[PDB]
Paper text:
PimE, the focus of our studies, is a polyprenyl-monophospho-β-d-mannose (PPM)-dependent mannosyltransferase that catalyzes the transfer of the fifth mannose from a PPM donor to the Ac1PIM4 acceptor substrate, leading to the formation of Ac1PIM5 via an α(1 → 2) glycosidic bond. PimE contains twelve TM helices with both the N- and C-termini located on the cytoplasmic side of the membrane. PimE belongs to the GT-CA subclass of glycosyltransferases, characterized by a conserved core module of seven TM helices. PimE, like many other structurally characterized GT-C enzymes, is an inverting glycosyltransferase, which is thought to operate through a single-step nucleophilic substitution mechanism facilitated by an enzymatic general base catalyst and can occur in either a metal-dependent or independent way.
The phosphate group of PP is located along the cationic half of the cavity. At the same time, the mannose head of Ac1PIM5 is positioned along the anionic half. Only the first three prenyl units of the polyprenyl chain of PP could be resolved, with the chain pointing towards the hydrophobic groove between TM helices 6 and 9. Our structure reveals a network of interactions between PimE and its ligands. At the center of the binding pocket, D58, located at the tip of JM1, forms a hydrogen bond with the C2 hydroxyl group of the fifth mannose of Ac1PIM5. Y62 forms a hydrogen bond with D58, potentially stabilizing its orientation within the active site. The phosphate group of PP is coordinated by three conserved residues, H322, W319, and K195. K195 forms a salt bridge with the phosphate, while H322 forms a hydrogen bond with one of the phosphate oxygens.
Author numbering: 21 to 403
The structure:
Amino acid sequence: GASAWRRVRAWGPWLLGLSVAVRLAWAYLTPHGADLVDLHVYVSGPATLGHGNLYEFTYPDKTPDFPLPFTYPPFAAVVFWPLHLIPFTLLGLCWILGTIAALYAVVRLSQRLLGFDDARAAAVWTAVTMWTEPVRSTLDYGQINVLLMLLILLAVASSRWWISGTLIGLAGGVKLTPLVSGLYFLGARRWTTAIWAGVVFLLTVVVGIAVVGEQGRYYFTDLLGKPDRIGPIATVFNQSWRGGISRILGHDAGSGVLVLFAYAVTAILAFLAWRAVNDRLGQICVVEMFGLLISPISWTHHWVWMVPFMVWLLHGPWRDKVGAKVFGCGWLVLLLIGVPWLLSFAQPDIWRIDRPWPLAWAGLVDIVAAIATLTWMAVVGRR
């Protein structure tokens, strides 16, 4: 029914408005709705700046069970030192509004990348995907994942080498996970932009050493970005290969042979999927789908890159293939409902790795969905 599709498109602004009102009401009416454990970490990290206790910092106020640390790169603390100058509520409401606006802007950028501009459809997409498990997880925790997605797609949209390079470098300096997006630029043969993005990431490392130095150092040696310190590896929310393999195993294999084989097979699948795509949005979406699978820690709130992927599926060049619609609706039903969020209740505690067949196998849900999408893209491209 394309008529109903047009009717709902016309009802965009007054559906995104409803979604934003509902989200804002929930956050500031329910206890722990505006808890913002990761925004409070970002605010209390730099708040201790200049006192030699920034990475030894722990934040158990909001989750006594698990003390939230400041695992971000020191450049993130440099960037968040201004947040120390803003009252907590004036920053919480600002951050929620910023994440919402970043979601709308990234949807608009995805539409522009696909070759069409549609403010109403962008509002509808923002409202519908606002409640996808990754987006609601980011909003709940205050984690900056929509903002970095916006920065990365802004870099992709801008053909100018310096703009894209600087955006990618700064965004990757704030968090190391989005650095995998740079690989897309390697695939796009944008060698100069990739070089500049790497240079900016190194200059962000230098800034972090300068400002947050003498307290946060050796961030790559003796630490290796160890997944354990960031958080539990086996918890179902950790939807990377490592999380699901640990669930089905009962013990974190980590760099084990069996995890390495999975890493290699997903590497080949993602490379074939990218080889099966030709448009910027699809290429970046495949690259980030692979990044979410290879990173040692990829919580649900990291999987906000799926939203541009669904936009590509339902509007990109493959808006007619039977498989394209099938997998777009599959991703929508999976994320909107959220299997990992539902399964997280079954496990005794976030630190329990042993699982029976149901709670372990169902823990491979998002991994299996991503691998199925990658294999489908590879086979359809090869054919």
